[PDB]
Amino acid sequence: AYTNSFTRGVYYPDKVFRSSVLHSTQDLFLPFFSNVTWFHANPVLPFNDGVYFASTEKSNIIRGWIFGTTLDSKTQSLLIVNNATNVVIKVCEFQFCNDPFLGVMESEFRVYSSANNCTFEYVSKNLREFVFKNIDGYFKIYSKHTPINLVRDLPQGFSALEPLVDLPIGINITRFQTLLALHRSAYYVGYLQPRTFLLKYNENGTITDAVDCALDPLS
Amino acid sequence: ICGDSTECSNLLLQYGSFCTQLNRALTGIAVEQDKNTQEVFAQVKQIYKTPPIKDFGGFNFSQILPDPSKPSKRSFIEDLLFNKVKFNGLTVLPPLLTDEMIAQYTSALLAGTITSGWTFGAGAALQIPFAMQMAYRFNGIGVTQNVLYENQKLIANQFNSAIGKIQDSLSALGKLQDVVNQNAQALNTLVKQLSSNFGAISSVLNDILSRLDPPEAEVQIDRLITGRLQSLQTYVTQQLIRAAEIRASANLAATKMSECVLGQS
Amino acid sequence: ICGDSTECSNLLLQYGSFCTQLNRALTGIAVEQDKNTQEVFAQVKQIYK
Amino acid sequence: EAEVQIDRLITGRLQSLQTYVTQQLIRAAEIRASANLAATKMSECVLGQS
Amino acid sequence: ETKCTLKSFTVEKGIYQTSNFRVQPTESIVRFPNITNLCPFGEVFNATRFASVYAWNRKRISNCVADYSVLYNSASFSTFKCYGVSPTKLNDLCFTNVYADSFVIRGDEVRQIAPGQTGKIADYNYKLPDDFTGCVIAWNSNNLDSKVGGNYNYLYRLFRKSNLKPFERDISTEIYQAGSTPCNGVEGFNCYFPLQSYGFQPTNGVGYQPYRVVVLSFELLHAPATVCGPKKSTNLVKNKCVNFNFNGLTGTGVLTESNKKFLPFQQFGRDIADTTDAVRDPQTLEILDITPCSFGGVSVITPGTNTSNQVAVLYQDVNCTEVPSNVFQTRAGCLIGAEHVNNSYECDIPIGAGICASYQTQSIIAYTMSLGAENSVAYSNNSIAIPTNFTISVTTEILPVSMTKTSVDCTMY
Amino acid sequence: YADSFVIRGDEVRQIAPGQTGKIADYNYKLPDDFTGCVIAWNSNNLDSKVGGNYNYLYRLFRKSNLKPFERDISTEIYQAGSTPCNGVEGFNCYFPLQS
Ligand SMILES: *[C@@H]1O[C@H](CO)[C@@H](O[C@@H]2O[C@H](CO)[C@@H](O)[C@H](O)[C@H]2NC(C)=O)[C@H](O)[C@H]1NC(C)=O
Ligand SMILES: *[C@@H]1O[C@H](CO)[C@@H](O[C@@H]2O[C@H](CO)[C@@H](O)[C@H](O)[C@H]2NC(C)=O)[C@H](O)[C@H]1NC(C)=O
Ligand SMILES: *[C@@H]1O[C@H](CO)[C@@H](O[C@@H]2O[C@H](CO)[C@@H](O)[C@H](O)[C@H]2NC(C)=O)[C@H](O)[C@H]1NC(C)=O
Ligand SMILES: *[C@@H]1O[C@H](CO)[C@@H](O[C@@H]2O[C@H](CO)[C@@H](O)[C@H](O)[C@H]2NC(C)=O)[C@H](O)[C@H]1NC(C)=O
Ligand SMILES: *[C@@H]1O[C@H](CO)[C@@H](O)[C@H](O)[C@H]1NC(C)=O
Ligand SMILES: *[C@@H]1O[C@H](CO)[C@@H](O)[C@H](O)[C@H]1NC(C)=O
Ligand SMILES: *[C@@H]1O[C@H](CO)[C@@H](O)[C@H](O)[C@H]1NC(C)=O
Ligand SMILES: *[C@@H]1O[C@H](CO)[C@@H](O)[C@H](O)[C@H]1NC(C)=O
Ligand SMILES: *[C@@H]1O[C@H](CO)[C@@H](O)[C@H](O)[C@H]1NC(C)=O
Ligand SMILES: *[C@@H]1O[C@H](CO)[C@@H](O)[C@H](O)[C@H]1NC(C)=O
Ligand SMILES: *[C@@H]1O[C@H](CO)[C@@H](O)[C@H](O)[C@H]1NC(C)=O
Ligand SMILES: *[C@@H]1O[C@H](CO)[C@@H](O)[C@H](O)[C@H]1NC(C)=O
Ligand SMILES: *[C@@H]1O[C@H](CO)[C@@H](O)[C@H](O)[C@H]1NC(C)=O
């Protein structure tokens, strides 16, 4: 299936406070009214320039992503996981199952079978959006958690995404995947292009509205 | 141009009197703006006052005479009109005349006209009753003056209704908003032109200066200087062209104040 | 200045708003020309015969 | 090596000459209006009664 | 200063812009992030048991806050040589990776841990490339590693086929073969076990006592960044033109307590026309406004040198409380050297906002100009005034009609 | 004026206006608007001897880079670290001339 975003995937281009100021930016955005894939429950996707990624549930079936160029050994990759404990970022050379996942006893993690040469570690319904990008050896992640009053369909509205993380890795990326918690006892993928937007800033400094300046003559 | 830095000032000293010319050009403009206002408004010898009565033959001037219950002492229509319209070396000077003074010139021009007709514009003010002055003016357009005296009440009612319609038509001034808008917008561009490299590595005079050594940095600082001096010349030339347009308008206003307010045309 | 060349266009972006200023200046004097002839000729309310 | 140093002088001197020529156009447009007013006063105050 | 600005010895009456007033700030208060991950070297420089010389260790220090000053000045090190980079400039640079190698050698073998040496250690135990970049640190450890009788747990390799490549490592234990006769895994003449052991004692002269060595090697691949020195700071102030640096933001101005609320990831705020006007303190996390410091223009009011040499001074728009008698505050700035009177005359020298100055009462005075006399028409509903005489008056009016015709010859100029 | 000295072979690129390095920092500094000319020629057969000619020294530590055309023949013990030196060698107390 395919679906239509309406006004989705707007993130704060950077720090620096700001108030009521229709500020104009050039960056990598998800164009308004786009053609976003639909997935149910998954396969190896491309990256090619950033990614929008939403998801909907009350349980937690979406348990992180895996990134990289080959998703195996012989080249390095990232791995972002969340068991019922908390997030586990990790950067080694792995050996990934071609269909990697984790179970739910509640024993799991048939994800990889190798953790060599680790160069970075870290340990510690609902709509959960994420924007992933990778520039100059930094892997930036923006995110937002809005509550839907549906269960698993893409809604309409405006909600800007706030920066979360910054990782000075150096890693090359060309592909990525997803991770799901099996049954033993809905998600979308947009892509980002270089656009020019007009963001409206509130008096507290939040982005409340935007204009995509390449949609139509009025814009 | 430079702005604080000292490596910039010695390099800019090499361009001669380019900055002295620009300051002279801008100072001439600012001195001309006070002469514009002196020529339009200070067209009266004395500060004339209206008498405490208002027996003007049935004519009612209350919406355009000054309001004694105000700090500014403006009139009702002058109050309607006034509710509808630090940086990197930039400064705004205040006008020589307050607008209290301007409102005080205009009310004296008004009391001269309502009390003496056109005699105060040619010499000493000679009082005349307002209906008889209205009858002199009916003669000036070729109407016989009993047409005024036999229709005084109707003529005064029509004046009063037409004066009443003006506030409603007010509560237009786009010609005054355009000048303010064009000037603010031309001043915003000059400040925005300071974040451009003009083909140097960066546009901030410290990061160029703390990441290269002098022989290497002087090359980039000269590019920055060239761009920033070009921007200022563009700004000053357009202010010169825009002030000559404001002067031709203040000249038309002075002629109108002489010929339509101090006489009959 | 560039004439359909992207190499030149991105270098032209390093000067800021020079071309926006130039187009704004030239457009304001094209608008003034229609005002000029409206002020001379449309001085009559009706078309008399 | 003298080409690079002569061009720096050429650019500056051209800039200065062209600034001189712009400010003269702007000053002549003002003298022109004054002479146009003087020509009207000669017609209306000297060859007539205004 | 006016005579110099005009390039003359006689100034005529007027008002002249002569220079500028710019408040001056002092001290360079620094700011950064609370001293967090500062790297815990106290594991490689504070281990209970080091590593052999033939199988050295290799720790890959990574993204952190490294403070080579606690190393450099610890005075406990008998040898601290830096090769690619002198030691004091380490806490001011950033690399991609730091590696730390650790081992234990004799006392007089510390001179083979250097680029371009030879000997049983540098040949085949641990070889340093010829363009090394890091630093080598070494200190005596007789009391920890030497025991009574002999500590035979510290071995080294003394036979190898070929010298090591730089940073190469070899933990094999094959029987060496000196002569041409094959060895078949048994000892004998010209078939030697390749590892020997320092027998360290407690009564051995210096140069035979064990030294512990750590070799830091800074490398710079081609990433985006990594660990580096620790920045310093101070205690920001307020209500004083200052020269500030907020973890990268370099500027000048007065700092003041704010009442805006950033979002909890935004560092500084900008205005329309894009100038930094607020910051957040990295240590205490409070928002502070940064208003441009005082400044303006200075004008000199003179009655003319052909009248007097007294002078008054206007400090364009600036509260008469921070200028450095008669100090007088105007809507146009602070006036010094003229007295304010209560009379009102015709304007002489225009100051602004209704204020003029004159050389009358002498000295220089201030006041509010006069619009004009005051005439009161005796208007009534049946009164008229009629003139009984006249005057013939004649006045002049002067107008420019031409200016001078000039020509230039571009090429000759 | 003519100044004369002897350096290594690959140190001739620091005798130029606006350079850095142990020679131009504190041995011999050329102003940034130099006017003259710089001449250099190899002299291996005259100045180099079998075993090592240790009579040609250079300064390798100084408090601050030289002003242009400034000269410094002092021989005080350099002090790298904070500890005072008292005219004797040791860690962070170095003789300032190498050969
Ligand atoms: C002059 O005209 C004004 C109207 O603009 C008169 O003031 C108003 O008078 C009416 C009744 O005639 C009142 O209902 C309004 O409240 C008045 N408006 C005011 C006072 O602001 C005024 O009375 C007229 N002058 C004379 C002498 O009649
Ligand atoms: C950085 O460290 C300082 C102390 O070095 C912290 O200051 C403490 O702040 C708390 C407020 O929650 C006070 O109760 C403590 O008394 C302070 N300690 C001292 C020594 O003054 C500061 O909070 C730290 N930074 C952050 C972001 O927590
Ligand atoms: C290894 O750990 C020890 C103990 O924590 C550190 O020794 C301290 O050194 C300082 C400065 O010489 C002394 O003031 C302290 O008294 C020492 N500690 C004790 C407990 O007395 C030592 O600095 C650490 N090594 C490194 C390289 O950091
Ligand atoms: C009208 O005004 C003139 C003055 O402009 C009067 O003539 C003056 O009369 C006085 C006194 O007789 C003489 O001292 C002057 O010499 C006269 N002036 C001139 C220019 O001759 C004249 O008397 C006035 N007429 C009336 C009727 O008042
Ligand atoms: C998205 O693109 C596919 C490509 O074939 C097309 O079939 C589909 O109709 C598109 N969806 C929308 C909403 O335009
Ligand atoms: C969650 O997964 C991480 C991945 O390595 C693991 O380190 C952690 O121990 C797991 N949680 C628990 C409770 O074991
Ligand atoms: C990565 O792992 C492989 C196999 O474990 C190893 O051969 C290689 O040396 C490792 N990379 C580095 C830089 O040591
Ligand atoms: C990523 O892959 C490209 C392939 O074209 C390669 O040239 C590049 O060096 C890689 N990135 C890094 C950091 O090596
Ligand atoms: C945030 O914005 C709202 C509306 O714009 C305002 O009422 C409020 O005072 C602001 N600040 C908060 C909620 O802290
Ligand atoms: C200027 O000086 C001359 C002679 O010193 C004098 O005659 C003249 O009155 C002076 N001008 C003024 C305005 O004082
Ligand atoms: C100058 O500062 C003082 C102190 O706050 C204040 O009272 C005064 O009003 C200021 N000046 C003006 C013109 O407001
Ligand atoms: C001017 O007059 C005011 C009247 O309010 C008085 O208070 C003030 O002291 C007078 N100034 C001088 C200098 O006498
Ligand atoms: C003069 O004394 C200074 C002391 O700072 C010294 O550096 C300089 O070399 C001396 N002048 C000459 C020509 O040597």
Give the three-class secondary structure for E172.
coil
B134 to B53, B114, B141, E381: CA distances (angstroms): 19, 10, 11, 13
E80 lines ligand 3 (CB under 6 A): no
Which residues in E194-226 are b (16+ Cβ under 10 Å) and which e?
beeebebeeebeeebbbbbbbbbbbeeeebeeb
User: E299 near E2, Cβ under 8 Å?
Assistant: no
All partners of chain E with 3 or more CB pairs under 8 angstroms: A, B, D, F
> Residue B32's Cα: distance from chain center in Å?
11
Smallest CA–CA distance, residue C14 to chain B, in Å, is 5
Contacts of F71 (CB under 8 A, 6+ apart): none
- Looking at residue E92, the DSSP 8-state letter turns out to be G
Q: How far apart are CA E276 and CA E133, in angstroms?
A: 40
Q: How far apart are CA E312 and CA E322, in angstroms?
A: 17
Torsion of CA E235, E239, E242, E247, to 10 degrees: 50
Token pair for residue E190?
Answer: 């010209």
Domain count across chain A: 1
What residue of E is the nearest CA neighbor of D9? E413
Helix D2-41 and helix B214-256, axial crossing angle in degrees, nearest 10: 10
Q: How far apart are CA E182 and CA B60, in angstroms?
A: 132
- Put simply, the answer to whether B237 touches D22 (Cβ < 8 Å) is yes
Q: How far apart are CA B164 and CA E302, in angstroms?
A: 52
Q: Whose atoms come closest to the Cα of A172: which ligand?
A: 8
Contacts of A158 (CB under 8 A, 6+ apart): A7, A10, A208, A209, A210
User: For this experimental structure, what is the resolution in angstroms?
Assistant: 3.3
Q: What is the CA angle E18-E23-E28, rounded to 5? A: 145
**What element of type H or E holds A146?**
strand A138-146
- Looking at residue E372, the DSSP 8-state letter turns out to be -
- Put simply, the answer to whether C21 touches B199 (Cβ < 8 Å) is no
Residues on chain B touching E297 (C-beta within 8 angstroms)? 91
If you write DSSP's letter for every residue of D11-25 in order, what string do you get? HHHHHHHHHHHHHHH
User: D20 near D28, Cβ under 8 Å?
Assistant: no
E332 to A22, B227, E179, E296, E314: CA distances (angstroms): 34, 33, 102, 11, 8
Indicate which atom in ligand 5 lies nearest the CA of residue A2: 11
Supply the CATH number for residue A179's domain. Answer: 2.60.120.960
Q: How far apart are CA B67 and CA B58, in angstroms?
A: 20
Backbone angles phi and psi of B250, in degrees to 5: -65, -30
E371 to B113, B117, B251, E347, E355: CA distances (angstroms): 18, 21, 21, 9, 12
* Identity of residue E113: I
Q: How far apart are CA E97 and CA E44, in angstroms?
A: 16
Q: How far apart are CA A138 and CA E374, in angstroms?
A: 78
Residues on chain B touching E292 (C-beta within 8 angstroms)? 86-87
Q: Give residues (CB < 6 A) around ligand 9.
A: A 202-204; E 261
Indicate which atom in ligand 3 lies nearest the CA of residue E70: 28
Contacts of E84 (CB under 8 A, 6+ apart): E131, E132, E133, E134, E218
Of A165, A199, A194, the closest CA to residue A12 belongs to A199
E274 to A21, B41, B87, C20: CA distances (angstroms): 11, 40, 11, 18
- Put simply, the answer to whether F80 touches E73 (Cβ < 8 Å) is no
**B 217-256 near E (Cβ less than 8 A):** none
**E 28-57 near A (Cβ less than 8 A):** none
* Identity of residue E205: G
What residue of E is the nearest CA neighbor of D15? E410
Q: How far apart are CA B232 and CA B238, in angstroms?
A: 10
Ligand 11 center from residue B147 Cα (angstroms): 62
Q: Where do we find the tokens 């360290």?
A: E200
- Residue E254, classified by CB atoms within 10 Å of its CB into exposed (0-12), middle (13-18) or buried (19+), is buried
Residues on chain D touching E402 (C-beta within 8 angstroms)? 31, 35
Number of residue pairs across B and D with CB atoms under 8 Å? 16
Chains B and C touch (3+ CB pairs under 8 A): yes
HSE at residue A187, side-chain half, CA atoms within 13 A, is 24
Q: Count CB-CB contacts under 10 A for residue E121.
A: 24
User: A130 near A141, Cβ under 8 Å?
Assistant: yes
**What element of type H or E holds D40?**
helix D2-41
Q: Max Cα separation, chain F?
A: 44
Report the residue of E68, E71, E72 to disrupt the F interface, i.e. the one with the largest count of F CBs within 10 Å: E72
* Identity of residue E7: K
Q: Whose atoms come closest to the Cα of E366: which ligand?
A: 12
Q: How far apart are CA A156 and CA A8, in angstroms?
A: 8
Strands A187-189 vs A35-39: parallel, antiparallel or unpaired: antiparallel
Q: How far apart are CA A21 and CA E274, in angstroms?
A: 11
Q: How many helices (H) and strands (E) does chain E have?
A: 4, 24
E391 to B123, E212, E385: CA distances (angstroms): 11, 117, 17
B82 to A143, B74, B99, B171, E282: CA distances (angstroms): 49, 10, 11, 11, 46
What residue of B is the nearest CA neighbor of D28? B244
Token pair for residue B8?
Answer: 């910039």
Q: How far apart are CA E188 and CA E173, in angstroms?
A: 16
Residues on chain E touching F81 (C-beta within 8 angstroms)? 72-73
Torsion of CA B88, E248, A17, A156, to 10 degrees: 130
Q: How far apart are CA E35 and CA E70, in angstroms?
A: 14
Give the three-class secondary structure for E359.
coil
Strands A87-96 vs E349-352: parallel, antiparallel or unpaired: unpaired
Strands A138-146 vs A162-168: parallel, antiparallel or unpaired: antiparallel
By alpha-carbon position, which residue is closest to atom 10 of ligand 9? A204
Experimental method: cryo-EM
Q: Any idea how long chain F is?
A: 99
User: A191 near A51, Cβ under 8 Å?
Assistant: yes
Q: Count CB-CB contacts under 10 A for residue C30.
A: 8
Contacts of B58 (CB under 8 A, 6+ apart): B152, B153, B156, B157
Ligand 3 center from residue E310 Cα (angstroms): 71
> Residue C31's Cα: distance from chain center in Å?
7
User: A163 near A191, Cβ under 8 Å?
Assistant: no
**A 110-149 near E (Cβ less than 8 A):** 119-120, 136-138
> Residue E394's Cα: distance from chain center in Å?
73
What residue of B is the nearest CA neighbor of E349? B96
Q: Where do we find the tokens 């008002």?
A: E15
Q: How far apart are CA E358 and CA E338, in angstroms?
A: 9
* Identity of residue A168: P
User: E104 near E154, Cβ under 8 Å?
Assistant: yes
Token pair for residue A121?
Answer: 């570690």
Q: How far apart are CA A130 and CA A50, in angstroms?
A: 10
Q: Any idea how long chain E is?
A: 413
For residue A1, the cross-strand partners are none
Indicate which atom in ligand 2 lies nearest the CA of residue E283: 25
Q: Count CB-CB contacts under 10 A for residue A130.
A: 20
Token pair for residue A7?
Answer: 């006004």
For residue B158, the cross-strand partners are none
Backbone angles phi and psi of E319, in degrees to 5: -50, 125
- Put simply, the answer to whether F82 touches E73 (Cβ < 8 Å) is yes
User: A121 near A169, Cβ under 8 Å?
Assistant: no
- Put simply, the answer to whether D17 touches E413 (Cβ < 8 Å) is yes
Q: How far apart are CA E127 and CA D39, in angstroms?
A: 99
Pick left, alpha or beta for residue B20 (phi over 0 → left; psi -120 to 50 → alpha; otherwise beta). alpha
Q: Count CB-CB contacts under 10 A for residue A185.
A: 7
Contacts of E352 (CB under 8 A, 6+ apart): B93, B94, B95, B96, E330, E331, E332
E344 lines ligand 10 (CB under 6 A): no
Of B125, B52, B49, the closest CA to residue E384 belongs to B125
Q: Please compute Rg for chain F using Cα positions.
A: 16
- Looking at residue A102, the DSSP 8-state letter turns out to be B
Q: What is the SS3 string spanning chain B?
A: CCCCCCHHHHHHHHHCCHHHHHHHHHHHHHHHHHHHHHHHHCCCCCCCCCCCCCCCCCCCCCCCCCCCCCCCCCCHHHHHHHCCCCCCCCCCCCCCCCHHHHHHHHHHHHHHHHHHCCCCCCCCCCCCCHHHHHHHHHHHCCCCCHHHHCCHHHHHHHHHHHHHHHHHHHCCCHHHHHHHHHHHHHHHHHHHCCCCCCCCCCCCCCCCCCCCCHHHHHHHHHHHHHHHHHHHHHHHHHHHHHHHHHHHHHHHHHHHHHHHHCCCC
Q: Where do we find the tokens 């007088």?
A: E328
Token pair for residue E346?
Answer: 């015709």
Q: Any idea how long chain A is?
A: 219
For residue A176, the cross-strand partners are A45, A67
Give the three-class secondary structure for E71.
helix
Contacts of E283 (CB under 8 A, 6+ apart): E31, E32, E33, E34, E233
If you write DSSP's letter for every residue of F11-28 in order, what string do you get? TGGGSSSS--SHHHHHT-
Partner residue opposite D31 with nearest CB, options E402, E408, E410 = E402
Beta strands in E77-232 (DSSP E): 79-82, 97-105, 135-140, 151-157, 176-177, 191-192, 195-200, 211-219
Q: What percent of chain F is helix, strand and coil (3-state, nearest 5)?
A: 10, 10, 80
Give the three-class secondary structure for E235.
coil
F46 to B91, B125, F6, F43, F50: CA distances (angstroms): 70, 110, 11, 6, 11
What residue of B is the nearest CA neighbor of F34? B215
If you write DSSP's letter for every residue of F22-57 in order, what string do you get? HHHHHT----TT--S-------HHHH--TT--TT--
Strands A51-53 vs A127-135: parallel, antiparallel or unpaired: antiparallel
Beta strands in E331-384 (DSSP E): 333-336, 339-340, 349-352, 355-358, 365-368
- Looking at residue E89, the DSSP 8-state letter turns out to be G
Q: How far apart are CA E385 and CA E379, in angstroms?
A: 10
Contacts of E160 (CB under 8 A, 6+ apart): E123, E124, E170, E176, E194
C48 to C44, C45, E384: CA distances (angstroms): 9, 9, 48
A114 lines ligand 7 (CB under 6 A): no
Residues on chain E touching B87 (C-beta within 8 angstroms)? 273, 275, 292
E389 to E386, E392, E396: CA distances (angstroms): 9, 10, 23
- Which residues precede gaps in chain B, with C-N > 2.5 A? 85, 171
Residues on chain F touching B14 (C-beta within 8 angstroms)? none
Domain that holds residue A197: 2-219
Token pair for residue E345?
Answer: 């005359």
Smallest CA–CA distance, residue C21 to chain B, in Å, is 9
- Residue E122, classified by CB atoms within 10 Å of its CB into exposed (0-12), middle (13-18) or buried (19+), is buried
- Residue A194, classified by CB atoms within 10 Å of its CB into exposed (0-12), middle (13-18) or buried (19+), is exposed
